[PDB]
Amino acid sequence: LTGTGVLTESNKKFLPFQQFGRDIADTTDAVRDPQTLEILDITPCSFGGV
Amino acid sequence: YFKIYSKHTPINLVRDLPQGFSALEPLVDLPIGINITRFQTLLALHRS
Ligand SMILES: *[C@@H]1O[C@H](CO)[C@@H](O)[C@H](O)[C@H]1NC(C)=O
């Protein structure tokens, strides 16, 4: 699962059958690391209008 | 694909089903690949 976003430590507690979490637009906003089983929020990188 | 969803709930009602809400989490996804049209559960006898 590829993407680009800021990774932060998450307060969500995934059930053991869950690997990722989806938002309204079905983009992965939370993911479980497959080596150390911890949850990370993925806030997107900042977007601006020049 | 044989999907097992499971939930354990502490209840204290005597006879009928309790009234409440409890979502069943998926436990085991089981690779059988066979036709199933009829089933039967297994009980245990008590001998004395
Ligand atoms: C290797 O991965 C498993 C689960 O994928 C994990 O439980 C284990 O801690 C990992 N080993 C190390 C040394 O991180």
Side-chain angles (χ1 to χ4, degrees), chain A residues 5-32:
Chain A
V6 185
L7 295 176
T8 54
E9 271 161 302
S10 181
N11 295 285
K12 313 177 179 190
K13 300 295 184 290
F14 277 22
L15 297 179
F17 59 91
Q18 285 163 337
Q19 180 77 7
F20 53 108
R22 289 194 174 108
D23 66 336
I24 303 299
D26 281 342
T27 67
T28 303
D29 62 357
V31 70
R32 172 183 285 170

mmCIF file of all heavy atoms in Angstrom, chain A residues 5-32:
data_model
loop_
_atom_site.group_PDB
_atom_site.id
_atom_site.type_symbol
_atom_site.label_atom_id
_atom_site.label_comp_id
_atom_site.label_asym_id
_atom_site.label_seq_id
_atom_site.Cartn_x
_atom_site.Cartn_y
_atom_site.Cartn_z
ATOM 1 N N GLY A 5 2.054 10.798 3.058
ATOM 2 C CA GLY A 5 1.415 11.549 4.122
ATOM 3 C C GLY A 5 2.271 11.581 5.367
ATOM 4 O O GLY A 5 3.189 10.770 5.535
ATOM 5 N N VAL A 6 1.964 12.547 6.236
ATOM 6 C CA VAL A 6 2.641 12.648 7.525
ATOM 7 C C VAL A 6 2.210 11.494 8.417
ATOM 8 O O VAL A 6 1.015 11.290 8.656
ATOM 9 C CB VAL A 6 2.330 13.997 8.190
ATOM 10 C CG1 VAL A 6 3.136 14.153 9.467
ATOM 11 C CG2 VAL A 6 2.600 15.139 7.231
ATOM 12 N N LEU A 7 3.183 10.763 8.953
ATOM 13 C CA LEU A 7 2.919 9.646 9.852
ATOM 14 C C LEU A 7 3.052 10.091 11.303
ATOM 15 O O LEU A 7 4.107 10.586 11.709
ATOM 16 C CB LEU A 7 3.875 8.489 9.568
ATOM 17 C CG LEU A 7 3.753 7.803 8.208
ATOM 18 C CD1 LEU A 7 4.837 6.749 8.039
ATOM 19 C CD2 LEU A 7 2.375 7.185 8.053
ATOM 20 N N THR A 8 1.986 9.912 12.079
ATOM 21 C CA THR A 8 1.968 10.254 13.495
ATOM 22 C C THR A 8 1.513 9.033 14.283
ATOM 23 O O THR A 8 0.834 8.155 13.752
ATOM 24 C CB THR A 8 1.048 11.447 13.794
ATOM 25 O OG1 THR A 8 -0.261 11.187 13.273
ATOM 26 C CG2 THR A 8 1.599 12.725 13.178
ATOM 27 N N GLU A 9 1.885 8.987 15.561
ATOM 28 C CA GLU A 9 1.435 7.911 16.438
ATOM 29 C C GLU A 9 -0.059 8.033 16.718
ATOM 30 O O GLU A 9 -0.575 9.129 16.953
ATOM 31 C CB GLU A 9 2.222 7.908 17.746
ATOM 32 C CG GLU A 9 3.494 7.074 17.685
ATOM 33 C CD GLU A 9 4.480 7.421 18.782
ATOM 34 O OE1 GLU A 9 4.899 8.594 18.859
ATOM 35 O OE2 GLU A 9 4.837 6.517 19.567
ATOM 36 N N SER A 10 -0.757 6.902 16.687
ATOM 37 C CA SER A 10 -2.210 6.907 16.679
ATOM 38 C C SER A 10 -2.784 6.385 17.986
ATOM 39 O O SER A 10 -2.214 5.505 18.637
ATOM 40 C CB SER A 10 -2.744 6.056 15.523
ATOM 41 O OG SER A 10 -4.159 6.077 15.488
ATOM 42 N N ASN A 11 -3.937 6.946 18.352
ATOM 43 C CA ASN A 11 -4.714 6.513 19.503
ATOM 44 C C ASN A 11 -5.771 5.474 19.156
ATOM 45 O O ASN A 11 -6.424 4.954 20.068
ATOM 46 C CB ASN A 11 -5.394 7.719 20.161
ATOM 47 C CG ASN A 11 -4.398 8.693 20.756
ATOM 48 O OD1 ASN A 11 -3.806 8.434 21.803
ATOM 49 N ND2 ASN A 11 -4.210 9.824 20.087
ATOM 50 N N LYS A 12 -5.968 5.176 17.873
ATOM 51 C CA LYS A 12 -6.937 4.163 17.486
ATOM 52 C C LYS A 12 -6.428 2.777 17.848
ATOM 53 O O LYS A 12 -5.236 2.481 17.722
ATOM 54 C CB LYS A 12 -7.213 4.226 15.984
ATOM 55 C CG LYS A 12 -7.481 5.613 15.432
ATOM 56 C CD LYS A 12 -7.655 5.554 13.921
ATOM 57 C CE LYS A 12 -7.961 6.918 13.333
ATOM 58 N NZ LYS A 12 -8.370 6.812 11.906
ATOM 59 N N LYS A 13 -7.338 1.920 18.290
ATOM 60 C CA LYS A 13 -6.995 0.559 18.677
ATOM 61 C C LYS A 13 -7.640 -0.381 17.673
ATOM 62 O O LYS A 13 -8.859 -0.581 17.693
ATOM 63 C CB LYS A 13 -7.460 0.249 20.097
ATOM 64 C CG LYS A 13 -6.856 1.150 21.156
ATOM 65 C CD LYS A 13 -5.356 0.946 21.242
ATOM 66 C CE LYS A 13 -4.751 1.767 22.367
ATOM 67 N NZ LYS A 13 -4.769 3.225 22.069
ATOM 68 N N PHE A 14 -6.822 -0.960 16.801
ATOM 69 C CA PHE A 14 -7.343 -1.846 15.773
ATOM 70 C C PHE A 14 -7.641 -3.210 16.363
ATOM 71 O O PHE A 14 -6.936 -3.699 17.250
ATOM 72 C CB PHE A 14 -6.374 -1.998 14.598
ATOM 73 C CG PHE A 14 -6.459 -0.900 13.568
ATOM 74 C CD1 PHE A 14 -6.988 0.346 13.877
ATOM 75 C CD2 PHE A 14 -6.017 -1.132 12.274
ATOM 76 C CE1 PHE A 14 -7.063 1.342 12.917
ATOM 77 C CE2 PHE A 14 -6.089 -0.141 11.312
ATOM 78 C CZ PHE A 14 -6.614 1.095 11.632
ATOM 79 N N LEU A 15 -8.701 -3.815 15.864
ATOM 80 C CA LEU A 15 -8.955 -5.209 16.134
ATOM 81 C C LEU A 15 -7.946 -6.058 15.352
ATOM 82 O O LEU A 15 -7.429 -5.613 14.324
ATOM 83 C CB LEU A 15 -10.400 -5.528 15.764
ATOM 84 C CG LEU A 15 -11.402 -4.737 16.617
ATOM 85 C CD1 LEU A 15 -12.825 -5.041 16.213
ATOM 86 C CD2 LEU A 15 -11.191 -5.049 18.098
ATOM 87 N N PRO A 16 -7.620 -7.264 15.840
ATOM 88 C CA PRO A 16 -6.534 -8.056 15.219
ATOM 89 C C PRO A 16 -6.783 -8.502 13.779
ATOM 90 O O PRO A 16 -5.817 -8.855 13.081
ATOM 91 C CB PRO A 16 -6.392 -9.259 16.165
ATOM 92 C CG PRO A 16 -7.633 -9.265 16.997
ATOM 93 C CD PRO A 16 -8.017 -7.834 17.140
ATOM 94 N N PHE A 17 -8.024 -8.467 13.300
ATOM 95 C CA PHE A 17 -8.267 -8.753 11.895
ATOM 96 C C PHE A 17 -8.126 -7.523 11.011
ATOM 97 O O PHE A 17 -8.278 -7.643 9.793
ATOM 98 C CB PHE A 17 -9.668 -9.349 11.688
ATOM 99 C CG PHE A 17 -10.799 -8.463 12.165
ATOM 100 C CD1 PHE A 17 -11.415 -7.549 11.315
ATOM 101 C CD2 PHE A 17 -11.269 -8.574 13.461
ATOM 102 C CE1 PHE A 17 -12.450 -6.748 11.760
ATOM 103 C CE2 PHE A 17 -12.314 -7.783 13.908
ATOM 104 C CZ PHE A 17 -12.897 -6.861 13.062
ATOM 105 N N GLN A 18 -7.840 -6.360 11.587
ATOM 106 C CA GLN A 18 -7.754 -5.122 10.828
ATOM 107 C C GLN A 18 -6.305 -4.727 10.584
ATOM 108 O O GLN A 18 -5.471 -4.791 11.491
ATOM 109 C CB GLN A 18 -8.483 -3.996 11.562
ATOM 110 C CG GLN A 18 -10.000 -4.072 11.484
ATOM 111 C CD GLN A 18 -10.670 -3.205 12.536
ATOM 112 O OE1 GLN A 18 -10.067 -2.886 13.561
ATOM 113 N NE2 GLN A 18 -11.925 -2.834 12.298
ATOM 114 N N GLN A 19 -6.018 -4.305 9.360
ATOM 115 C CA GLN A 19 -4.682 -3.858 8.986
ATOM 116 C C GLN A 19 -4.621 -2.366 8.719
ATOM 117 O O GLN A 19 -3.660 -1.708 9.128
ATOM 118 C CB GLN A 19 -4.199 -4.619 7.743
ATOM 119 C CG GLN A 19 -2.815 -4.237 7.253
ATOM 120 C CD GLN A 19 -1.696 -4.824 8.092
ATOM 121 O OE1 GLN A 19 -1.927 -5.640 8.984
ATOM 122 N NE2 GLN A 19 -0.467 -4.421 7.795
ATOM 123 N N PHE A 20 -5.628 -1.814 8.047
ATOM 124 C CA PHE A 20 -5.654 -0.408 7.674
ATOM 125 C C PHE A 20 -7.010 0.193 8.028
ATOM 126 O O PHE A 20 -7.975 -0.512 8.329
ATOM 127 C CB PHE A 20 -5.342 -0.164 6.177
ATOM 128 C CG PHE A 20 -6.199 -0.952 5.188
ATOM 129 C CD1 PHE A 20 -7.166 -0.290 4.444
ATOM 130 C CD2 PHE A 20 -6.054 -2.329 5.000
ATOM 131 C CE1 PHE A 20 -7.962 -0.972 3.535
ATOM 132 C CE2 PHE A 20 -6.845 -3.016 4.087
ATOM 133 C CZ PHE A 20 -7.801 -2.335 3.357
ATOM 134 N N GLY A 21 -7.070 1.512 7.961
ATOM 135 C CA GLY A 21 -8.313 2.239 8.179
ATOM 136 C C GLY A 21 -8.561 3.222 7.057
ATOM 137 O O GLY A 21 -7.630 3.845 6.551
ATOM 138 N N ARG A 22 -9.828 3.354 6.670
ATOM 139 C CA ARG A 22 -10.198 4.253 5.585
ATOM 140 C C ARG A 22 -11.028 5.424 6.104
ATOM 141 O O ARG A 22 -11.777 5.302 7.078
ATOM 142 C CB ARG A 22 -10.985 3.510 4.498
ATOM 143 C CG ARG A 22 -10.158 2.538 3.662
ATOM 144 C CD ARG A 22 -10.935 2.130 2.425
ATOM 145 N NE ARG A 22 -10.161 1.318 1.494
ATOM 146 C CZ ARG A 22 -10.351 0.022 1.290
ATOM 147 N NH1 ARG A 22 -11.300 -0.644 1.926
ATOM 148 N NH2 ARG A 22 -9.581 -0.617 0.414
ATOM 149 N N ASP A 23 -10.873 6.563 5.430
ATOM 150 C CA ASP A 23 -11.613 7.789 5.702
ATOM 151 C C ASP A 23 -12.859 7.843 4.814
ATOM 152 O O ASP A 23 -13.311 6.818 4.299
ATOM 153 C CB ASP A 23 -10.704 9.013 5.526
ATOM 154 C CG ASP A 23 -10.257 9.223 4.088
ATOM 155 O OD1 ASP A 23 -10.234 8.257 3.298
ATOM 156 O OD2 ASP A 23 -9.931 10.378 3.746
ATOM 157 N N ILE A 24 -13.447 9.036 4.683
ATOM 158 C CA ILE A 24 -14.614 9.240 3.827
ATOM 159 C C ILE A 24 -14.289 8.924 2.369
ATOM 160 O O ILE A 24 -15.074 8.266 1.674
ATOM 161 C CB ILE A 24 -15.124 10.685 3.995
ATOM 162 C CG1 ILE A 24 -15.462 10.969 5.459
ATOM 163 C CG2 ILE A 24 -16.319 10.950 3.108
ATOM 164 C CD1 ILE A 24 -16.547 10.096 6.013
ATOM 165 N N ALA A 25 -13.128 9.366 1.884
ATOM 166 C CA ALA A 25 -12.760 9.174 0.485
ATOM 167 C C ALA A 25 -12.067 7.843 0.215
ATOM 168 O O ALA A 25 -11.513 7.671 -0.876
ATOM 169 C CB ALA A 25 -11.844 10.307 0.019
ATOM 170 N N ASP A 26 -12.099 6.910 1.178
ATOM 171 C CA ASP A 26 -11.466 5.585 1.088
ATOM 172 C C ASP A 26 -9.967 5.679 0.798
ATOM 173 O O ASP A 26 -9.408 4.881 0.044
ATOM 174 C CB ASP A 26 -12.168 4.679 0.071
ATOM 175 C CG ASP A 26 -13.443 4.069 0.620
ATOM 176 O OD1 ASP A 26 -13.616 4.060 1.858
ATOM 177 O OD2 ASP A 26 -14.260 3.570 -0.180
ATOM 178 N N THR A 27 -9.313 6.666 1.401
ATOM 179 C CA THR A 27 -7.862 6.734 1.451
ATOM 180 C C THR A 27 -7.393 6.265 2.821
ATOM 181 O O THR A 27 -8.071 6.470 3.831
ATOM 182 C CB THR A 27 -7.352 8.150 1.172
ATOM 183 O OG1 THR A 27 -7.742 9.023 2.238
ATOM 184 C CG2 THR A 27 -7.919 8.672 -0.140
ATOM 185 N N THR A 28 -6.238 5.611 2.847
ATOM 186 C CA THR A 28 -5.737 5.036 4.089
ATOM 187 C C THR A 28 -5.253 6.142 5.019
ATOM 188 O O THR A 28 -4.187 6.727 4.807
ATOM 189 C CB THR A 28 -4.621 4.043 3.790
ATOM 190 O OG1 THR A 28 -5.118 3.034 2.904
ATOM 191 C CG2 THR A 28 -4.137 3.388 5.071
ATOM 192 N N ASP A 29 -6.049 6.430 6.049
ATOM 193 C CA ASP A 29 -5.699 7.431 7.047
ATOM 194 C C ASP A 29 -5.089 6.827 8.306
ATOM 195 O O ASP A 29 -4.563 7.572 9.140
ATOM 196 C CB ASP A 29 -6.923 8.305 7.386
ATOM 197 C CG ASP A 29 -8.091 7.522 7.987
ATOM 198 O OD1 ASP A 29 -8.036 6.281 8.123
ATOM 199 O OD2 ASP A 29 -9.094 8.179 8.339
ATOM 200 N N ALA A 30 -5.164 5.507 8.467
ATOM 201 C CA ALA A 30 -4.513 4.816 9.568
ATOM 202 C C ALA A 30 -4.030 3.463 9.070
ATOM 203 O O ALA A 30 -4.723 2.801 8.292
ATOM 204 C CB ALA A 30 -5.453 4.642 10.766
ATOM 205 N N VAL A 31 -2.853 3.042 9.533
ATOM 206 C CA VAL A 31 -2.234 1.813 9.055
ATOM 207 C C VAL A 31 -1.516 1.132 10.217
ATOM 208 O O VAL A 31 -1.053 1.785 11.158
ATOM 209 C CB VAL A 31 -1.280 2.093 7.854
ATOM 210 C CG1 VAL A 31 -0.023 2.857 8.277
ATOM 211 C CG2 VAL A 31 -0.943 0.818 7.075
ATOM 212 N N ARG A 32 -1.489 -0.199 10.181
ATOM 213 C CA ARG A 32 -0.741 -0.997 11.144
ATOM 214 C C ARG A 32 0.599 -1.385 10.534
ATOM 215 O O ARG A 32 0.650 -1.899 9.411
ATOM 216 C CB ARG A 32 -1.522 -2.248 11.548
ATOM 217 C CG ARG A 32 -0.736 -3.230 12.397
ATOM 218 C CD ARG A 32 -1.550 -4.476 12.697
ATOM 219 N NE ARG A 32 -2.578 -4.233 13.702
ATOM 220 C CZ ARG A 32 -3.544 -5.089 14.003
ATOM 221 N NH1 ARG A 32 -3.657 -6.252 13.381
ATOM 222 N NH2 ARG A 32 -4.421 -4.771 14.951
#
